[model samples]
Target: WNEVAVILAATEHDTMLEMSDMQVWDHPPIVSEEDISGSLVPGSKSDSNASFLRAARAGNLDKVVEYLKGGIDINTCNQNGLNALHLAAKEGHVGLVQELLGRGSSVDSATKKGNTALHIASLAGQAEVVKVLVKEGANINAQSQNGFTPLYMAAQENHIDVVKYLLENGANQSTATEDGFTPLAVALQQGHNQAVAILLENDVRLPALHIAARKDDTKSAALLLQNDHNADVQSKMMVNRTTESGFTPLHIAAHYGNVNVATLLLNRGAAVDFTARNGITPLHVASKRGNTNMVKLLLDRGGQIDAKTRDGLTPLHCAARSGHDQVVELLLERGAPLLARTKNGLSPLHMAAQGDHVECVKHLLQHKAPVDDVTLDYLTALHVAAHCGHYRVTKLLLDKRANPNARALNGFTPLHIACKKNRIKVMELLVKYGASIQAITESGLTPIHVAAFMGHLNIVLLLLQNGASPDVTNIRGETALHMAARAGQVEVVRCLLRNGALVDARAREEQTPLHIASRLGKTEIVQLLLQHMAHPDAATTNGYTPLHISAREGQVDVASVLLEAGAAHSLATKKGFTPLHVAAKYGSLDVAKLLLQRRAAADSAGKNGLTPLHVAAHYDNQKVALLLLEKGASPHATAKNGYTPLHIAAKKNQMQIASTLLNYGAETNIVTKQGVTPLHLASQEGHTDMVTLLL
Candidate 1:
């Protein structure tokens, strides 16, 4: 029993020693006689009175002593729950703070809003008072009224002494404040040189280094680097940070000609070749701004001379394309490899040709860049020059032996492109340089075909005069006549047919010029085709004549023209559709009326075993359905789906059409293949009015 009792006694003594030696014990402050005599009170009759609260806020050692002796309570709190010690610490009153701490005051005590004494000390920049508070067991890591720690406020205010004191007293440095900012980042931004130095001395990471560089503070940047900031800083800058397309910090610097910052960054290993999110590089940006120095800096700093981004263009490409000759010369002198293609594969030379950058083209040729690199569309430099009608670029490239016969990815040579674009000067240059007059794409389309496609009559005459093959058929077997007819190029079509371009030349699909004209609803082409004896009844692979296609596609005027041009009214499609059935299927009342007026077969059944009335009623075209029924269409005829015209009208809620069919002695009880009555189908689809009318 005694042994057990001795062990218990030893444990109690050790706990007491530990407790007395602990630095953070809670206690209260004593009121001095001077404070009591000086009109400051600690515990007045009414503790809630403003006078007592003012004494707590005075934070003067003598005043606090006088207040306590004047009967102010030591633990008295203000409306904000702040005691005398909190006010003294916040005001940086070292003597008063010391007096409060000496009397065993609450060092870590906070107000109702959780702002502690240490937070106030940090904000006030009271280094000595903060130090004294720390010595007297103040909460060094206390978070405050807004979740900001003391170290954060100290660093933000550029208070190096306070920051150092806080750090020495075991304050946290790496913590992010309520605003997502850390002490190190905030210090670097405000140019707190020593405070930044100290924070870096403790290994804090400032990931937003690009933000610092953007702020143009070299000192903060230098301090960050001295503190071991990471390299590859340019890569961290976001490319899409701007609202406008292609706006980056590099672009901004280049545009404003901030050469110092640009050079500093370049020397500090910034990426000179970084492209914006829009595939535009700093060179493009600088060229647009006409900044000569920025251009030189970028070129000399290993910017890719011909680096094309998403648009397949390089710096030289942009310079040449935008007609910046001086920028082009600078790039070319820096060994900027020209003829680099875009996604379409058009090179700087090609863009120069298109943009009329004549001097730039000459410079590129002098640099030994290719003059004939084609694009994915088979467009050569000559093609681009011819298309844009740049006489000088065309002349220069032709002189440099740029092959006028060079084919584009689409199989078009310079002459074809020129003729299509109506570049008379470009055409003259190509013809002078032995450009082929009869070149063809893989589709067999030649310069004449291109001219006819665009309806350029002058170009058509030039090509015809230059031995262009007007009779050549495309891969679709369409001649120049067919292209002109389809595009409504009436003059070109007339010219082609007059020049003996076979008007009846069938495309690969067996569609002639007349068929294309009718299909496209070109009334003029139809008249012209008929004048040239082009077959109006020429059928496609699907057995559709010009009139059948015109009727089905709702080209009422074209159908009328074809009918007048001797098109067969009784011709049936491969689907067994006459012109009337085709018009009815698409619900074209105008086309159906035209065909009916022309005595087209109204009761003709199509491939689906449906007559014109069945087609019209199926789509709920009340006017067309009534017209077809009045035109002698069999209302009792059923579709392959086993639905009569009356059944269709009832199901589709066409009350007028259904009533007309019923009044015309049509059967109302016809069932479909689904075995549902028309009234039941209407009810299922929620056509309430149709259901009531049918019932």
Candidate 2:
């Protein structure tokens, strides 16, 4: 794929394209969108702390002494309360600390989070610092604001020298972390025997078989039982204790290929069928890894042949997804469920095909795994294989007579997915195996629409050469060219045009592809469209021309191109609005300026007798209104009901425009046909600011 060589086959229409840079991503299989005409398109470090903190941190002996001798405060702390002793002790500067302590530095001075010198030193295994601090009478049992004591951290982290030093110095062995971590308990759980042995010799006593199993230390883990020598070994679930992520001893053993420890844990009552938080049992892990021995061990020791996880993944589904054909064969020989469907309705074969596991898929297919069995989303094995571009798996599924034309939830067939993905090799297979090239989605998207809109030039060429109609309209009466034009796909547009696509093809509302191109500012696409004999002034059913759309979206460049092609802005829609009027309504200042520069009728009135000034007045378009006002617009121009531009400015609370209209000598007391003046319009519409301005 990196070095692609396109061997151009004989084309049915001889339509071709020069393609590049179509970065195809997986679009949502379902397609739905907006209204037809009103489509909404949318490092630096800090300054020095007086050289005292820097000296302490880098273990600079003379700098610390010089700073202290220079009368910089010895016990002074930083913004976070971390001072000289905390920094000196943390980096294990044994000799520098002698100078700092001799200078009367506060050893117990802590950070904002209450981490003291001993707490930092002990955690860092700064043993020499620990000796100096404790011998200097630093608090051995200093508890942080987070309820973590020095000895508790030292013991739990398995800092052997620090732990024994702290313990021998009478540090508290019983203080627990706020989150329920007793030092001895965590030490025993993580299989820290050195610290556990130290803890056992002192005041206190506490899965960890899980870590022991994970390390594959069968000999060390043999006697690594619970320290409750006074209680029965089988009384508690120690052998089955799980990690924080809920991996039991059995699960860990199976995953890391520790068979002997698994046997010991199983004999010690480890749950061979033990379910994790996600309900994944040890048998599932072994099967997924194709550990035939582990799989056989669990199955023989009464591991559930088809235990369903929270997502309903059985051991067979796990193995099949991993392409573990050997374990799959073992599970099959032991009568594992062939119809194991997950929460998403994925069969074993569905998972295998999703992963492109050809051999696993073959094993399932040979054992009567349903090739065409639809998942809950209605995706078949072929659908899964086609979407992944798994050529061999696709061929196998198709060769096994999987329904190449199988319609998913949105009616997207294999060819629809293959075309959207631009997998020409997979697409060729789908087409050869009877993929419906002309198939439409629920929203009337044919494979060509998906391909064309995504700018897959190669895909468009392939689909067209294989009998896809370039001008085929969706349910909205939109052709593939219409989609490609709106999306600004230039090369796709060219190829689609070369294949006999109508240049001015209209959609449901009768707006041509040019209308969309102009609205989206596809300048290149607009030029290409015009070169193919597309009408520049083609209007929709409501008379909204391509120029009107360009004006509506403020596509100044596209409007320029349309104007060069002789697009008449003088045309009005069903509501009788001109391009300047449309531009003013949407506050398109550039397009309005362009239209004005092109000698557009500034005072052109439509059905309601509303000129461009009146449209600009109704909306909050100060600049456009100003442009029209300076360009010979009549501020006193009345609408259909004799409501002048000033009346609308007052009614809509256009204080800026209202003042600007007055500057243009608009009559203050302008009235409606019912004799309602601008003051009456302001008061009735609750325009208090307008009323004050009028007063």
Candidate 3:
């Protein structure tokens, strides 16, 4: 009865006077706050009040009017700062929006993001509400915080009606945001054909056909080309126009896999062979994208399948390099060049192997694409595969009878390259396939030498078990053991020793493994070599024993190991100086003491007739010289030039050694074979202090 009474009371209004009771009941019931509050429990007022917002969003005019009559704020905004008028206008509620406007709702009120009711209505395609808001003094050209005007938003959303209304109402057609995207450009980018059509009809001239083709807008592209029909002139203009990046419509179509656009371009007499600024044709782009249909269409249109890019790469090369197996097969079936070489001499097979494209490799090999083609550097596909550690590609190439033993310009065979890269799988495969285990580089380093030098123990063992010679020598005549000892690879050294590497193997310089290890002061290596009975007393061509090298290099621990291993202390070079002489010349006092303690002859003379004490004084080694003199070294000794220790000390400006020699009862007046005494030599060399001491 109360609902009927309320309905009868509302029917007295002029707007509802024409409607029957059914029409009034069809709408949402107008419940007052008292009617709703009586049904609500305590603390449910907040929940109950939310019906106003829901009613406003739902366009329920009765609930909105009831809420307004119940003393609710007319400008109440949701969390998005959107008042009821904004929602009603955005949702196309023209009647509800009019009711709110009659209640004095702000038409120009903006949301937190600066979106006005007009902007929201325009973007939502609410044409009726947009017109009402515009007539009520809403800003038609209002820009948001991001500089998006109502016109741009309408065009971007493909709302043709709203766009037309906004444009007729003075919305700027060419207005752009901060990103410089105008309304037409945004519409074109979003593939809005209707809005694009309307904008074009509004005298908006954009780069229509090319951008449509690039964005796969086939419908727009066709309309643009055909709508402006001078079939001869427009055909030329549409097909031949290039973008700033020099991409023709056909090229862009092929690059983006737009088959329809590509077909449309081709039908309009677009040249299939029109090369880009990069010398890439549509076929090259199609092949790289693995678009077989585009490739077929392009090829059927007289596109050159064997066209070369700026890098001398053909379409097949691009396909193979990008691992496009289907495209590769298509190009091959169409008689594309198989053995075509790039500027760097890399064939399709070489590119495939380098990119580790196993399927492409198999396709190329099945088509006889010259598996053994060499690069400009003379590297075969197997060499590149092994060097790049593409084990499967390497296997595929080898299965096709690729030369596993093929040598690069550097004479590095695939096995040698594999070992150098520590590729055990490729190395094993190559060896199992009968690759020469002893294949040598141009520098004469075999697989074993490369493996040992790189310290790849597994590869070394693999090569050794596969019949790699442990004693293979390089150009320097240095063996694998020589490199291993020099590089301090303990495990490799141990493996080489176990594999019967000659412990006393000599290089071109006649130095042994012990000489190299001891010279570098590799204590662990020295211990290993001696433990394996390496000849500690072996000498180089210059007669430098391991002991001599150790002493000269100041390797005290190494020298001690040598001495403990029974290294001969009295051994000398061709000049006849012992280890003590080398220690004095290099200023190794600890080595000198150790050698002397090992019964090294301190007064030993070399070929120059200069003893250890003379070498020490000549080199200004005061401490070693002092030690030699105290060890009863002959300070008065002379070289073949007749220059005594004092003569050398004074000529070389060794004042301390000269003073020490003089204190040791050295003959200060001794002359060289040139008849020059110590005082004359010091005067000639401008050593005034030494001259004064000598005088």
Which candidate wins on lDDT?
Answer: 3
TM-score (C-alpha) between model 1 and the true structure:
0.50
Q: Which regions of candidate 1 are displaced past 4 Å?
A: 1-359, 373-380, 442-444, 601-611, 614-619, 632-658, 667-695
lDDT of 3 at 29: 14
What's the candidate order when arranged by decreasing lDDT?
3, 2, 1
Per-residue lDDT of model 3, residues 1-695, tens digit only: 01111101121132112111101001111111100121112243444446676788789999889888887777766565777787787689999999999987998888777888888887778889998998888988787766778888888788888888888877887666665556777787777888888877765333556667768887777666654434565425656677656667888778777888899878866778887655778888888778888898899989999988766778898888779999999999999988887766778887788779999999988897677888877888898899889888998888888888898887889888888889998889998898988878777888898889889999989888877779878777889999888788999999999999998888878888888888789999999989987878888988899889887899999988889989899787988888888888899999998887777787887667878888898788999999888887877778898988888888889989999999999997677777888878789999777777776
Per-model C-alpha lDDT, please? Answer: 0.70, 0.78, 0.79
Candidate 1 lDDT over 387-496, as tens digits, reads 77889888888888888898766676778778867887788778989988878876677778778888889989987877776888766677788778767888888888
Ranking by TM-score: 3, 2, 1
Identify the candidate with maximal TM-score. Answer: 3
Provide the clash count, candidate 1: 26
C-alpha root-mean-square deviation, candidate 1: 19.8
Instruction: Please give the TM-score that candidate 2 achieves against the real structure.
Output: 0.67
